[PDB]
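Posting here for the record, re: 2'-deoxyuridine 5'-monophosphate.
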Amino acid sequence: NAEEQQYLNLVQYIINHGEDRPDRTGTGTLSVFAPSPLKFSLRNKTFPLLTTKRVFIRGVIEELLWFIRGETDSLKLREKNIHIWDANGSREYLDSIGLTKRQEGDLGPIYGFQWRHFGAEYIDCKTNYIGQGVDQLANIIQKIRTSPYDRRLILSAWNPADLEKMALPPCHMFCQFYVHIPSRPELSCQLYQRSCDMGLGVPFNIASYALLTCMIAHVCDLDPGDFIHVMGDCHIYKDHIEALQQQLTRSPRPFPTLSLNRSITDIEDFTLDDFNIQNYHPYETIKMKMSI
Amino acid sequence: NAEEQQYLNLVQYIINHGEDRPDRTGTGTLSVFAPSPLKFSLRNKTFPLLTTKRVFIRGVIEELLWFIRGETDSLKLREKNIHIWDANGSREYLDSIGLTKRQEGDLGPIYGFQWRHFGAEYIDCKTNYIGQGVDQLANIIQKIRTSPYDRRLILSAWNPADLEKMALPPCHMFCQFYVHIPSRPELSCQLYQRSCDMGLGVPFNIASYALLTCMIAHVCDLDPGDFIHVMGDCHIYKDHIEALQQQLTRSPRPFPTLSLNRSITDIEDFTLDDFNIQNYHPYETIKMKMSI
Ligand SMILES: C#CCN(Cc1ccc2[nH]c(N)nc(=O)c2c1)c1ccc(C(=O)N[C@H](CCC(=O)O)C(=O)O)cc1
Ligand SMILES: O=c1ccn([C@H]2C[C@H](O)[C@@H](COP(=O)(O)O)O2)c(=O)[nH]1
Ligand SMILES: O=c1ccn([C@H]2C[C@H](O)[C@@H](COP(=O)(O)O)O2)c(=O)[nH]1
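Prediction output follows.
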């Protein structure tokens, strides 16, 4: 796209200029710190769903809703045919990180929970946290309506006071919304990702947050502006270096568009069905492994 | 410089592509959201202390130590003759924001307190919080000491659960550290600043974090790498426009240098005299009016 390309070039930079870092998850990876952020116009309904490799947008949409509901149980993504949180939730893994009395499938006070109940005291993923902690999302929405120029529209998942309790620390830790009014519309979003996995990570989150912006934009009666991905520890797994170059030689197809609704009116009232993506023409999928 | 010059461009870019916006503090501005982050090298003892305008380095130093100590009382900073917090702590401001039962000078759970006592239950800037909350700064130094390639070296002041109790929401909300070991050194730092005042702010913060970075690198035996300033709502106050083209025309003098200590080894044991800044050759100073 020149959008997705800009991303590809980064997939090459981290390769021809990456850094050999011994990885804690125990794996060989190349990495670059704080490279130049990736921008994606969200205009004309365009949705930045990378074409150079089938992205699991089905899990993306499903996981975002899981986030907004403030749910922290992987079992719920399992009940919907999504196993992206099975590992960091395996009874085995919980133990490795000391969470032994924590029941399986309970990811701790991750993303969503912080999004809607920040300060709230976490205690089991099956409890109802209505009224507890601070609801960033609701606030963000409320503000954008009230006074849209606010410079404090911050959605975060990074709670240092609740880290150990988490099955995995907030990877994409927070984002700041901004709305430029014409000379009203243009809801932009710049998020900060501390650790970025270009192969499976970045793409998924690009779409993940592009929707977020679209959803919140939609509900606030705004147009999505652009989306800029800011990354810190950007990295690539060696066991994929080759499975990235063949991709790099691939020509990026134009991004599809996203059509929200049929007057869905709540944000907390979105369903897999209320999201419509048209003209997605990606290349042949590639089984992406990883590490933990 | 081209370091400072890059900054200068950004200042003109805002003037040319800036957006007329109603400022909350009250007075008019021009803002650009998500501009390309400024990088500054700390390589070879260089210190990004802008030269096209005298910078309150002393203000900068005293305030960092103040931060580190986890102090939240402006009065302290006043006993040292700094007045940068006298406003947002004035009796008149506190009430405008509702903290009508807050004794003047009590900024609340801001930067410092969050850095060393995050989870802690703040209450009165004269109380002893020793061992309360999460001591991010301490945990960061430590992880860097043990496992330096940690993708989780985050220091943040943004606590959604405390924002109201604060005299002002964190501006330079957070930063992640990263260390590139050779074939060890390089302690680079990337901070996200939701609201950047290219006028006074940014410059002051480039120094503020440039030092924090050096300082920590110092106690970890590492050498600094570079500094990356990422910014959200980057802007300018009209009442300083004409006041900028004048500066936009000055030729940036090369940055001075920073040599820390005499083996100060803790980050908790620093003082003005431990900071020697060789070769700071800025142009005369420019009186700029804030905006509460
Ligand atoms: C960064 C930061 C923290 N801050 C705090 C802080 C608090 C409220 C604000 N409010 C507004 N409207 N804009 C700001 O940028 C701002 C900054 C100077 C004062 C304060 C901060 C100054 O006066 N700096 C001197 C000039 C005056 C002097 O010599 O004393 C300088 O030259 O640096 C930064 C710089
Ligand atoms: O949305 C996500 C979630 C996880 N990760 C990756 C980043 C790192 O490779 C590892 C997390 O590292 P630490 O939690 O140890 O910091 O998982 C991503 O890239 N994107
Ligand atoms: O280091 C700093 C401290 C904050 N400010 C400014 C930014 C805004 O001018 C104001 C904060 O705007 P609010 O989001 O608080 O309204 O304080 C800076 O630019 N730099």
